[model samples]
Target: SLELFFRKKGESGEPLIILHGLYGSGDNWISIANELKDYFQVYLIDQRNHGRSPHADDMSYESMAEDLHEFIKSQNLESVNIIGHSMGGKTAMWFTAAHPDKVKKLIVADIAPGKYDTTSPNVKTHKKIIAALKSIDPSEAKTRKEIETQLSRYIDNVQLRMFLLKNIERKEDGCYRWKINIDSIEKNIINIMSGITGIDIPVHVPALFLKGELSDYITDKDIPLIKEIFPDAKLVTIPGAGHWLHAQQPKIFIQKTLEFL
Candidate 1:
């Protein structure tokens, strides 16, 4: 069974699994998890190849969904409520479609189950960030500040740079290394860009889609396909929010999510 690192909260209730997006870890959702702690047992997970989880060359949704399956089984959980963002959202969708009985409810944030353009602005932005991460020579940087300065050349957005920098770790031997398997992710970039596959049947579980109004990740054109796959899926828009809607509008995000849950 594939074991993943996770932090569990809450006193007692059904399990609610929280999966983060690319370049993010369970730590990213701690604050959000805290908000839901009273109502359900929240499990913030570190997906494979990212965060504190074990790294693997296969970064496809099939592998990720399997990882989630093993995690649920390992925990002895008969079923769970899941909330996943971006890449994580795709994994949740694939998992629920394959094992509908194991999922109580599904919440997908800021993503659609469709082929995204590789040359699209967001895709290109990620490509640039990946290129920047690849360009850095960790051994050469004396301090985190120096590495951040070097990263600035490729990534101008301070917030984005800081978010990516969270993967950096300074070893006990005074050597710096990335927590995530950057090479594996880079090698499987195409696969990561692709849409979820092999899930032909519609998932009958209750589902909710939280979309960022300012984010183009999900658009009007994607609604029909979303409905086709999740006929009961309800899409709610978060105003004044971008791709990272949870972080951009936590209050609204949590309120809307709690309402659905």
Candidate 2:
């Protein structure tokens, strides 16, 4: 079970669901949603065990796809456009493949089709992220900057920090709290990478793969697997962009997205 925030544009016909990566929440896609709201009814959902979504001891792509299907049927939506980043990218791919009719178009950002054995490049980074999250005393943080400073040493990228910071909530007691289930995410980092045992289906819907030029998330090695799953998929690379390409080059991202849509 998952609890998530739903936001929509002022006026739009069909809906667009934005899914974020590991350790991320619905708010990560808010900025991108606002940019494209005029063209879409953006529905930002926090995936199970992340953000406001319900936490479960068990998490799997198959289950995640089922949850997405229910979400669509529950909303009485005819269909939806989907954009997913990193770990969210895997979910979007799995959902579109599993439920081809449910998706009008699909956008996957900076993630490959192959399975990842580890979430971090090495165990040290993983340990650091977990340690930082554990060390943060949300009860002591009075300001947003304080939260940023506390995680600065652990998280180097200011943009990534800014993205994560959006998930921070200031309580009435003048303290801050994270909307994400950090403990579960940190504990289950390996699960996030290795849980998808197998997924290979040809998804006929219109699909776009936004790759980061510098990031190896999508490599030449993964194209065969990606094509196996989505034969219609078209790949695009962003200059000077890494895994977080959308954040690095918003204008380019929007342009490409509009072109694809």
Candidate 3:
């Protein structure tokens, strides 16, 4: 029941679809989507349980891909260019691999087609952030400033804190509630990070696999597995960037993306 909040740009041509990472909404790609609007219409999608999308217990790649598939059909779209980051990137790969004919091109940022362990330090940090967001009771707070100050101990990244805070909404009773379905996200974190296997169809749709040099999401050992499913794939490394390469280096990301187009 998640309705994707989409922004369509450009007068004509096949539009591009932008997908955000875990706990991220479609708006995260706004900066890049607007810039690409000149060459291709951009469609920023808020995946299930994120942003303005409907909350659901199911958050697997298969289910999310089905949601996007329906979205495309409902919009009367034939083919499109797609870019997915992290969890979104996994969904992008799933959709393209399952329905290659529906995709004109595909771009995946900082992820591979395999499961990763949540035991790492980075994973723990993300979990801590999620826990902090949920634990910080905003009911007693009167303003956003108060919530930020309260969460400052667990969350030091002001930008990321602001990103997640977009979900907070003041109710009619003056009490605060999260616009996002927090329970659903919390329940699905493990499944969201768990990758898809047994999918061997090569997504030969002129794919681009973008990675952050500072990120360990994609390693040299992943090359064989990646090429197995994307024989014509291209990989680009963005320097001084972590998992969120686009956010860290927007100008460079946009330039390289445009060059690909």
For candidate 3, write residues 112-178 as lDDT tens digits: 8777777764467668877987787777746888877777777887877887787787888888877
TM-score of 1: 0.97
Candidate 2 structure quality by residue, lDDT tens digits, 13-71 = 56888888877777666677778888877888888877678877666666677777778
What lDDT would candidate 3 get against the real structure?
0.83
Q: Is candidate 1 or candidate 2 better by lDDT?
A: 1
Candidate 2 colliding pairs, count:
6
Model 2, 255: alpha-carbon shift in Å? 1.1
Give the whole-model CA lDDT for all candidates, comma-separated: 0.90, 0.77, 0.83
Candidate structures ordered by lDDT, highest first: 1, 3, 2
User: Which residue pairs show backbone clashes in model 3?
Assistant: 2-54
Q: Rank the candidates by TM-score, best first.
A: 1, 3, 2
Please count the clashing residue pairs in each candidate, in the order shown.
Answer: 0, 6, 1
lDDT of 2: 0.77
- Selected candidate, larger lDDT, 1 vs 3: 1
Clash pairs (backbone) in predicted model 2:
1-54, 2-53, 2-54, 3-52, 3-53, 3-54
In angstroms, how far off is 55's CA in candidate 2? Answer: 3.3
